[PDB]
Amino acid sequence: HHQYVLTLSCPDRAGIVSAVSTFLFENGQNILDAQQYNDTESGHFFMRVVFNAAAKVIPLASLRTGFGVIAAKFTMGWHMRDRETRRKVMLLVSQSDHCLADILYRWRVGDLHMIPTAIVSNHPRETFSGFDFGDIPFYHFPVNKDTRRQQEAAITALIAQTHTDLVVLARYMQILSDEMSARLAGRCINIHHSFLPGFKGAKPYHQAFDRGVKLIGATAHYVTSALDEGPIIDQDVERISHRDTPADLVRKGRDIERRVLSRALHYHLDDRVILNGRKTVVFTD
Amino acid sequence: HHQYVLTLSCPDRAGIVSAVSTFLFENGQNILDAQQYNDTESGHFFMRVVFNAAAKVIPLASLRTGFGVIAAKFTMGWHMRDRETRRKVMLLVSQSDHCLADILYRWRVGDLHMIPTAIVSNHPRETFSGFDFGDIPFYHFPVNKDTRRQQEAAITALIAQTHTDLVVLARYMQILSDEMSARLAGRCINIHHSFLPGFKGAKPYHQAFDRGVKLIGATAHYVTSALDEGPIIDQDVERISHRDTPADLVRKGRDIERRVLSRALHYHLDDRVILNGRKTVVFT
């Protein structure tokens, strides 16, 4: 028995839950799990509903057509899919291999429900070591200050060829152009370190070490034109002590970075993240 | 503008969310926050809905009356209240004061939204020290093996006199009879310690110490006739190390009990807990 998930956001208005649940009811479906949230400050409503067939077995394509009538009337941004259909995910990497290694591990053991389409890098394959990607293809697309348009065009073509749904910047260090970021709105997740308090300028890990901080954090977010400043999906920290050398800070920074990105990716892949302007609504569990 | 909370459980059936949301929509209310869960193993559906007036300001009494029609059709166990209405809570204590002290602290700082009605004990007031209950009254209801009926009647009368909504056993050590446990179904919360692995018999703290455990837990649950075994609301642990003496284990045991009970109490008071036979649905 197939389960489906619907997520949506729209301007707050009376009777949204009534409209959505009545549609599922009249179309012979049954609600398994659902959550709703009204952001009264932004005037937007948010819903996640997981459902399956009860009196009528209606295929996804028909339900979408049907639900599109409601979505249009309520000005909804929405998505309905079969919980079994894995999203096609592309992984971009530069030098650091920790987020890449963790995502692949989590995918391999059944914790991330996805189909990796490709591993893409601005550096050659042989700069990475200790990896067997099996049937996941690795692509080297070189780039410099004068060839960004050509390189982005190449990545964009591959995203299309592979029908990629999500791009993960797993410590990919080349900045995406405003246009490429715009094309990947809500479909590109980045990870970066975060400190309490923040350090700016050269050598942030050595400044943190000299400051004697007791925590190191990481922030996973959707990519926009503002460098490392798009909608935050998830944040977490791990402990730092007097015992930790600068080398230990780097290792712990890598650990919280991979933890936060993999958890963020899990929320995205489980249809738990909905954009709310500059922010996100995340239906956790 | 007042906010209201509706909680409900019923046998699973198509169109429950349609019926409940259409009722609120047709009555000029707006949903602020809501959660639904379908327990497909037990065949029961669960909902929590927080709402307020939109096109129509309808009083609670009228909304309750209207919602009663829907509840009858779907055979719902339900509750609808104004979020600002604090529940009337009674605290029972015997000797240990840690849970009592924590709950009163959490109440005084705004973390537990309640009106304490009474502090009740099988022991005299002067066996407790370091407390100023202010305007919360303390009652001493003595009991022995032969006077359990009289003492429970005194407690029951006070519950009714004070319109108490919830009874918290804050390490109260007298076992409630099956009949009193039944009268308080879904309205009585207990706390007890829990180990990994479990220890049974005399001196469980000394067995835990000798076993060299690295955790101590606590479990908060609704009271039923099965001694310390009713529907589980919340469970948590805290760490134990080789540095911990038997006295340290007791102190850590009190710390986890107070934490888990106060948290369990918070979920109850915030209309996040729904009974599901021998279990609970907790919307966190």
Place this chain on the structure above:
Amino acid sequence: HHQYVLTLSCPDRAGIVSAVSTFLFENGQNILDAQQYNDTESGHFFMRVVFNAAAKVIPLASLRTGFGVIAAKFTMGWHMRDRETRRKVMLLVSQSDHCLADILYRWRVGDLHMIPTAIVSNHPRETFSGFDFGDIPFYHFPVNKDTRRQQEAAITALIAQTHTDLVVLARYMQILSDEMSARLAGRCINIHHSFLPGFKGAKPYHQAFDRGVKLIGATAHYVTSALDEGPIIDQDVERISHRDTPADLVRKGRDIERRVLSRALHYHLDDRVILNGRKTVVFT
């Protein structure tokens, strides 16, 4: 049978542990637990040793005199005390009692081993609900731009009068002068909340809310001449979600502040904190 604690820091050199442990052994003491750490970046060594009498019961005063010889040789900053001697702690507070209430609660239930000497505020007594104040003396020492030297003189005099060992700024909002800070080096603890990333200027909670952060943190630290920037003792966070309004962020900020300050205070009171220049060594 009393337990003593020794803490120390000094420039790193071979044979420090040999010198300290040989001294305790030769003076008939027995080590119960101890920790040592060599900061190879700064070249300083740190030790914490808990001990009691074995073959010889020697008074604290005599052990201090004997240990002074070793401390001079190794250029040590050190402290030796009886663990049963409660430090005398002064609590400073402004308009919000959240940190003060938590400290008083933890003291009253036995979690913080101390003697509260006084509660000092720049606001009058009627500003506070007074829960858990009991018989602790309250002093309203008002201050403004023009009375700062006189107000600090009154605090400096109260500290000497009461023999205060530690001053806690329980979210006290008036800035201590540079000489006050200097006088209280290693003996004044402040607390402040922040976000990932931090915010500066008008309406900082509205900024965090607008940014859509998922964490709020707090930092406990020793006070120095730099505003809110001395040696960090403890840091922690708690979750923020899309459900939290700006008022909820204020509440959660208060909650993380009180948690971190109470824990930082516990470490200080348990002789677990040693200064390391701009940093700390915390033997948890």
Place this chain on the structure above:
Amino acid sequence: HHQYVLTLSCPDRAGIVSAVSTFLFENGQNILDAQQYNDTESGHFFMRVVFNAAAKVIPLASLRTGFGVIAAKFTMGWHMRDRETRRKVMLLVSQSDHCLADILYRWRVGDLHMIPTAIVSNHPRETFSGFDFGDIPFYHFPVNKDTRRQQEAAITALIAQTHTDLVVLARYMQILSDEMSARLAGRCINIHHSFLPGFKGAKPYHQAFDRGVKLIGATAHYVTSALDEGPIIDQDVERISHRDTPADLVRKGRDIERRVLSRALHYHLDDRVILNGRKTVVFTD
């Protein structure tokens, strides 16, 4: 400059710290990190000391010979090694690779410092996906009610041949004999999951699910003659909710088991665990 670590336990007596630290000092060594704990209930003293060369660069063999004089006098059980010498670890596994995959992942990414000598199973190689096995020797040593002595003889012979210092039961489901357990005392780590409270008999997951637990736990321990009851190294829990099915409890049980086993293994490999009768002393941070 190499770092060395010494761990020890002995009957409590005055001047243990004086004796050990005076030895290291007089032998030209410098203490980097050290911890001491007196179990006044058992009357035993515990120490961990990490050190390196100061005035005299003394080889390990010479320090051991020297320290052995002190260890004899104080009735010490002790160990001194170079922190850079990786322990040789044998991984035992049955039908589920959850603990094995996690250990192999953590080893490959640099989180666990060890040399895997071999993967031994009572099931064939085709049972496993083989992710991260790489060039680690695999051996199918089958066993039944009547071949236990011969199978353990094969394992015992492999341990000797490979110079194995530690055996990890990565959710290996065959019970090791009392003699086999005795031979591997302090050198064999097992993992098992449980609940608050525990359950016995048919369908243990269904009993937990029926009880409505909100936590699932795991315990890592050294193996003894008592089935699943040796010295506890580490324990931890994760959350269980009303949303979790019995199949979800199985998944979460595997997750808590691998997390606890990998952490316990890390403590063992970092020379942080000392046996204290039926308990352990674990120097964390």
